[PDB]
Design a binder for this molecule. Structure first.
Ligand code: 9T6
Ligand code: 9T6
Lengths: 286, 285
């Protein structure tokens, strides 16, 4: 037997954890003895050319090993044919989007900066492996415990070619535009520095406890206008070109906001690094 | 096992340190155990010129001096002409990065000691028949509070024996505000040309690398900020008239007079690195 081989007939759905246009994550119990004693797992599946993407995502995740990256558990391959499901460890506390609004009383600035350092460690590790994540947002950071977070979704993660600085994306319709660097929005180019920009926005969310009224979308739509439709991205690009950025969160020290601003230099080459962010946060935590 | 051969599979990128002249420098950890405990190294490679990089590698490989950044090795491609230069990593960085953060730590005496070290490293290079062509405070690395090292050799060129200079062809990205008149006017680079650049470097060191008082900003105040493609000719003209960068704040006249000797118009009349060393040492007694 293979413990990474999950048979479809024993993989039983409990409830939804979250879903996109073309993908979804469900809580499942893998219960081969059939007495409701099997382990709970998170299962990512496609909604009935994304199979290739999911298989590549699986091969990425399976080979990533870091305490701040969600753990691969296995796959469920379709008896029928081509289809596949990604099986991951289940973290009950959920993403920062779910967790932070509920745990405001026990999560102070110190712990927010420690989560920020953990995200940076996971991202630095990913970068060293020549991956660009392309979807770094609070909603994709899972809470392991009060003291530990994990990057929990790799659906858009792409490999940077050796001796190149960016990946160019063709399929870009389901893009988190309000987390995206100018080069991504303008030219569909994705550097490691593009993930740093995304980290800055993620840091803003963390600092605002993922409050919906203070979310990146809500704040950018307040700047540009909420009912521009298909012109939203171009107006966003224009607002970024002018130099406008998300404002300092309430109760955020200027030192922290300056580190955030260092993620948001218009030019990718002018932005800070994940290691320089860690150093900056660690200085504030000492 | 060759200790100067660095396997690409164990070189992990951390962050970009800087870039110049078709080259890129990155901090990497050489981490064969896969646990982030490996030694940190500075890795120079091209932005996607290999001949220039290979020549730089061979130069640095054969330089051994306490004030010259240490060559560690190379990372080479398999069945390719690709190559990366591996050097020691100095976490404090260049004077440009370090001095503004450490003014309280680094007084005049220490600045002069750094000046001597720079001169020693440059004089060693000169004795090897090389011209540096890019001596600026950004290219001087801080080993510690007590020690600096010249940290990049991207533009370094050999001067032929029985010749006093190297004639430069590729010059579009030259650091004109550090360049002697002969380099600006005739593209001729002497050892004396490096002495000129050292004087400008000293000015930076004495001003703690403040950008508002940088060589570029100061010269632009003299000649004019918006002369565009005519900047170098206006710079040459100003130099011909005898005008120079002013005395730094709190720099005594005797340090400034040593600096002025670096800036004699004719290269054959300038002070030498050994003469500078003696002059600085006299002040340090
Ligand atoms: N409690 C949970 O939600 C949860 C628990 N363990 C998990 N292991 C892998 C994913 C995952 C979870 N959810 C997913 C995660 C967070 C959020 C909602 C789901 C889809 C998303 O893209 C965005 C990634
Ligand atoms: N902390 C550092 O920056 C650093 C540390 N150790 C190093 N060993 C070799 C280069 C180097 C470093 N940086 C480079 C150096 C200084 C500056 C920025 C880089 C490119 C440059 O041309 C200009 C030479």
């Amino acid at each position: 037997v293979d413990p990474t081989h999950f048979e479809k007939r024993f993989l039983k759905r409990i409830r939804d954890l979250g879903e996109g246009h073309f993908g979804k994550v469900e809580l499942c119990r893998y219960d081969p003895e059939g007495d409701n004693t099997g382990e709970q797992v998170a299962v990512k599946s496609l909604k009935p050319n994304h199979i290739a993407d999911l298989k590549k995502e699986i091969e990425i995740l399976r080979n990533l090993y870091h305490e701040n990256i969600v753990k691969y558990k296995g796959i469920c391959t379709e008896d029928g044919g081509n289809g596949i499901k990604l099986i991951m460890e289940f973290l009950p506390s959920g993403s920062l989007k779910e967790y932070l609004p509920k745990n405001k009383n026990k999560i102070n600035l110190k712990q927010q900066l420690k989560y920020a350092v953990q995200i940076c460690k996971g991202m630095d590790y990913l970068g060293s492996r020549q991956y660009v994540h392309r979807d770094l947002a609070a909603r994709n950071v899972l809470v392991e415990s009060e003291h530990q977070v994990k990057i929990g979704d790799f659906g858009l993660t792409k490999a940077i070619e050796t001796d190149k600085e960016y990946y160019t994306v063709k399929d870009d319709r389901d893009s988190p535009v309000f987390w995206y660097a100018p080069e991504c929005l303008m030219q569909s180019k994705f550097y490691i520095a593009s993930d740093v920009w995304s980290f800055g926005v993620t840091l803003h969310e963390l600092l605002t406890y993922c409050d919906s009224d203070s979310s990146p979308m809500a704040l950018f739509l307040k700047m540009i206008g909420p009912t521009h439709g298909q012109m939203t991205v171009t107006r966003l690009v224009n607002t970024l070109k002018e130099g406008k950025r998300l404002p300092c969160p309430p109760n955020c020290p200027d030192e922290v906001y300056q580190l955030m601003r260092k993620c948001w230099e218009f030019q990718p080459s002018n932005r800070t690094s994940f290691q320089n962010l860690i150093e900056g946060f660690e200085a504030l935590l000492k």
